[PDB]
Amino acid sequence: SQVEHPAGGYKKLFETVEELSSPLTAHVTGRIPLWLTGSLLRCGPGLFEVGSEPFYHLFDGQALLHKFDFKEGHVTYHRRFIRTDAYVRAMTEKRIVITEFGTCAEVTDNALVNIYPVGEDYYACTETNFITKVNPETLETIKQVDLCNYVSVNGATAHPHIENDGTVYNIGNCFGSIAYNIVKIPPLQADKEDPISKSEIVVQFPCSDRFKPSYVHSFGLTPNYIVFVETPVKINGANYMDCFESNETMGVWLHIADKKRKKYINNKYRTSPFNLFHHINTYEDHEFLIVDLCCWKGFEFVYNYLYLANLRENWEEVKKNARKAPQPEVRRYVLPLNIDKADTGKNLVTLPNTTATAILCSDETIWLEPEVLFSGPRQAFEFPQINYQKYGGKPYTYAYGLGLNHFVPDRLCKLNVKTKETWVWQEPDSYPSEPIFVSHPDALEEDDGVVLSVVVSPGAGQKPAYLLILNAKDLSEVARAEVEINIPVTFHGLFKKS
């Protein structure tokens, strides 16, 4: 039954740490596969107060860039704070200078969320117009880039999609009346000029409210389509959180655009209210789009439950605080691309392998019901990853995720989206991070590889943290690389093959 955490080890995820001057050698137990060569780069908050001035929210602490390097069975660990305007000015003025998502002190450039490649460069990011070029070898900070210099968006998510050729797609709200713009950044060309200088708006999605865009964290992409899910979480001494509100009547509107023709498709897909942070995968199956999502049932903003004061409470209180929260659920939606009026009033989802439905109404809305893939009481399958390079945007079978127990990460999970079978890794008093998949270079199968996760493990005698390596087939442990220092929460990252 229910896994419990009375010792309160999870509080270490939210405790300030010091950066390192140089990389440190981790102590390896088991055997790290010799084909595993490259760097796991991850981002998280690393400084949770400036002197006696606290940051209040999980998404406020100062960006810290982490690196595990793998070479010939050996592992090192390094971390450096990102020298953003937020961090530099805070160090200079010795106070909180720039307003953060949930702390009132100029838009924040605190890139604590993710890192991604553009041409030969790498950028750490949050969700604003500012991204920060960083050196993936040394973790030094290179420069600040303002997306507003190049394209018409107010911000951009921390979850761009990267195509196999290096083309980058993202979404942000804009003044197209409010709208949402898809931005494309090209691959590096022979001239080698900055791909960001060649950014353009591909297509625009309409907004459900003239003056209130929904909060958008991620989106879906296939070879031929772009999918955007417009939730009821709306943006209306203030901080960013103060601007959010819930629309009680709209439910969720889903939108598709033709990627190659750069055209919005006026299909009115609709469903019941949920929050959404992470798309899992999206693909085309006959004339339908399969849309796999990590949902939170309800319209209250899940971020209201992620203040540091609440995440640092003792365990019975953490559980109590999540009692009225939206419930997490992995759902498959299926969107028909062909809408035939002759079928008005019927289920259009004629696929053999799903219980998802899509009902064509007389007013032309298309009401969707999901196929539930995974559902546990206050137990989220979240921070989803797939074999993205080979199966992103395509028919697939496996997803990896971080299991959240009343919002505390405490296990790693694998899901067969076809059969709903699951696998789990967990250890008492250990709190893992998002799992990243690395394929065996010569794999022909989808799940022939490892997953990497950073695990916090406070306790008498124990090494305080470690990089965990699991077999992707069954989440069995292959190795771990232990370090002698704490590592705070990290949200997203990547594995750069070397």
Annotated binding-site ranges for Fe cation: 159, 217, 278, 492
CB nearer to a second copy: pick between 100 and 329: 329
Counting residues that bind a second copy (by CB under 8 A) gives: 43
Q: How far is CA 488 from the centre of its chain?
A: 17
Residue in 188, 250, 337, 359 binding a second copy, rule: CB under 8 A? 359
272 touching a second copy, by CB under 8 A:
yes
Q: Which residues pair with 404 in a beta bridge?
A: 380, 409
Min separation Cβ 403 and a second copy, Å: 14
Interaction residues for a second copy, span 127-186 (CB under 8 A): none
Query: What are the phi and psi torsion angles at 316 (to 5°)?
Result: -60, -35
343 touching a second copy, by CB under 8 A:
yes
Report helix, strand and coil shares of the chain as percent, to nearest 5: 10, 45, 45
Residue 191 CB neighbours (<10 A): 7
Q: Output DSSP code: residue 325.
A: S
Strand runs labelled E in 387-427: 398-405, 408-416, 422-425
Burial of 426 (0-12, 13-18, 19+ CB in 10 A): middle
Residue in 51, 237, 377, 461 binding a second copy, rule: CB under 8 A? 377
363 touching a second copy, by CB under 8 A:
yes
Min separation Cβ 371 and a second copy, Å: 7
CA distances from 221 to 172, 258, 388, 393, 486 (A): 15, 10, 11, 6, 37
Residue in 352, 442, 460, 461 binding a second copy, rule: CB under 8 A? 352
CB nearer to a second copy: pick between 395 and 441: 395
CB nearer to a second copy: pick between 36 and 330: 330
Judged by CB under 8 A, which stretch of 45-53, 93-101, 124-132, 367-375 contacts a second copy? Answer: 367-375
Min separation Cβ 343 and a second copy, Å: 6
CB nearer to a second copy: pick between 74 and 418: 418
Q: Which residues pair with 296 in a beta bridge?
A: 275, 328
Residue 305, both tokens: 């439950």
Q: Which candidate, 171, 39, 61, places its Cα nearest to that of 112?
A: 61
CB 40 within 8 A of CB 467: yes
Min separation Cβ 46 and a second copy, Å: 32
Residue in 169, 315, 367, 388 binding a second copy, rule: CB under 8 A? 367
CB 229 within 8 A of CB 276: yes
Match 């761009």 to its residue by tokens.
Answer: 160
CB nearer to a second copy: pick between 6 and 352: 352
CB nearer to a second copy: pick between 209 and 300: 300
Judged by CB under 8 A, which stretch of 174-182, 270-278, 382-390, 475-483 contacts a second copy? Answer: 270-278
CB 417 within 8 A of CB 399: yes
Residue in 27, 95, 261, 346 binding a second copy, rule: CB under 8 A? 346
Residue 497, both tokens: 């093959």
Residue in 49, 258, 313, 369 binding a second copy, rule: CB under 8 A? 369
6 touching a second copy, by CB under 8 A:
no
CB 185 within 8 A of CB 198: yes
CB nearer to a second copy: pick between 52 and 419: 419
Residue in 326, 392, 409, 449 binding a second copy, rule: CB under 8 A? 326
Q: Which candidate, 356, 398, 396, 401, places its Cα nearest to that of 380?
A: 401
CB nearer to a second copy: pick between 22 and 362: 362
Interaction residues for a second copy, span 285-304 (CB under 8 A): 297-300
306 touching a second copy, by CB under 8 A:
no
321 touching a second copy, by CB under 8 A:
no
Q: Which residues pair with 476 in a beta bridge?
A: none
Interaction residues for a second copy, span 396-425 (CB under 8 A): none
- What is the Cα–Cα distance from 437 to 276, expressed in whole angstroms? 22
Interaction residues for a second copy, span 187-246 (CB under 8 A): 246
Residue 3 CB neighbours (<10 A): 12
- What is the Cα–Cα distance from 403 to 455, expressed in whole angstroms? 13
CB nearer to a second copy: pick between 11 and 406: 406
- What is the Cα–Cα distance from 78 to 301, expressed in whole angstroms? 34
Match 């939108």 to its residue by tokens.
Answer: 255
Interaction residues for a second copy, span 93-112 (CB under 8 A): none
CB 425 within 8 A of CB 410: no
- What is the Cα–Cα distance from 277 to 367, expressed in whole angstroms? 21
Residue 324, both tokens: 């009225």
CB nearer to a second copy: pick between 16 and 321: 321
Judged by CB under 8 A, which stretch of 42-50, 158-166, 267-275, 277-285 contacts a second copy? Answer: 267-275
- What is the Cα–Cα distance from 238 to 385, expressed in whole angstroms? 34
Binding residues: 159, 217, 278, 492
Residue in 121, 230, 292, 329 binding a second copy, rule: CB under 8 A? 329
372 touching a second copy, by CB under 8 A:
yes
Interface residues with a second copy (CB under 8 A) are 2, 246, 248-249, 271-273, 297-300, 323-329, 343, 345-357, 359, 361-363, 367, 369, 371-372, 375-377
